[PDB]
Amino acid sequence: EVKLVESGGGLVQPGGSLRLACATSGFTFTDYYMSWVRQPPGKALEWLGFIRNKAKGYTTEYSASVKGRFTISRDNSQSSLYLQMNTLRAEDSATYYCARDHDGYYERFAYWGQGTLVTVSAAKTTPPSVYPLAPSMVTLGCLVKGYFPEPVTVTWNSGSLSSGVHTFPAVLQSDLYTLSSSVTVPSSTWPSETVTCNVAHPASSTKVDKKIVPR
């Protein structure tokens, strides 16, 4: 299977730098151009640059938006792509994706990674407080309050439950995000079966589990 996995994102202060990495597998890496693409929350994809394949000597090209300030490189023994991003400013806040580009024959980005979120801000890292929201169908929820930066990952039952889940987009205020998540299950199953909210906030090294008790 082709796989691309970005890492190295997260919060960075204005004026700082980050090095993103993209670990690839399941294809002969050297045969491919590799691109980076970014997407500010809610806005359009922006191509940033590429590094060419071995046939073309691994040369680089960049969009005018970042040329001279970002540097793409690759490690062909470790099948990894990098983006060194310098001098960061507000417009650099985005999801950054690596994409597998051109092979010398097909002109397509056939595979993309999951993306890594970069937040350029001087606001301070804060872990969430997670609160349980207790009650044919029954709806339960958790409230994930007062954290920074994005993202959090919320699941239901360590991932036992999905079809009936709504995790709302967070909202930012006074430097902190809040969200919620609901889940709907048959009342024929609750409360016999424990329902559990799993909240991860890697920035703060928080991972919390909140059991929903009737109440």
Binding site: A44, A110, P132, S180, S182
Partner: protein
Amino acid sequence: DIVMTQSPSSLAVSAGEKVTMNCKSSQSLLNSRTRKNYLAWYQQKPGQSPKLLIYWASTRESGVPDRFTGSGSGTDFALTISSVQAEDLAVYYCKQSYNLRTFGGGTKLEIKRADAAPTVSIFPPSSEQLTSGGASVVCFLNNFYPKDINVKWKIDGSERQNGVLNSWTDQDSKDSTYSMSSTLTLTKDEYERHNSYTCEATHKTSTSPIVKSFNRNEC
């Protein structure tokens, strides 16, 4: 540095509708050596990474449904969906790769369906939150259509406007509904001064709101 546009910016279509969206390049993307146009189409479903649909203007990527067809040449390109399905809600992007790469700005495809009223549920502040001095009252409005909806909070029968924040999920890929949360945040001391808390949803589905309420002193 080739510049790409797309139109319309959005479209709203019912399941089974035929839809076309357009892309325009500033320069011809026809490569004269291969006689192909270096224009690709990507589908980005909500919360997911972009996915390749079409490359070389008209070649379908393996796995892609045959309802997706790319066409055009030179500086004008189109993506046509023969019969839209619920799962096709997405932003669709064209991308040139004739000289460097450039994405268009996207066409957002949303799905129209029959009107549906929300299912409402209300939750008092948790005892954990109250212990530390804050009080968030949560209302969920589930599985409704269309997206826009009126949510009103009352405290002891009086409307409350300040301190309410509302958030909507992306449209559902199976049933084409929306959901939304409404969160009222007060201090513990304010919360403890009132009894009845009510969330009222007024949807184009009915002149009568859908309401849920609790009384704090019955807690």
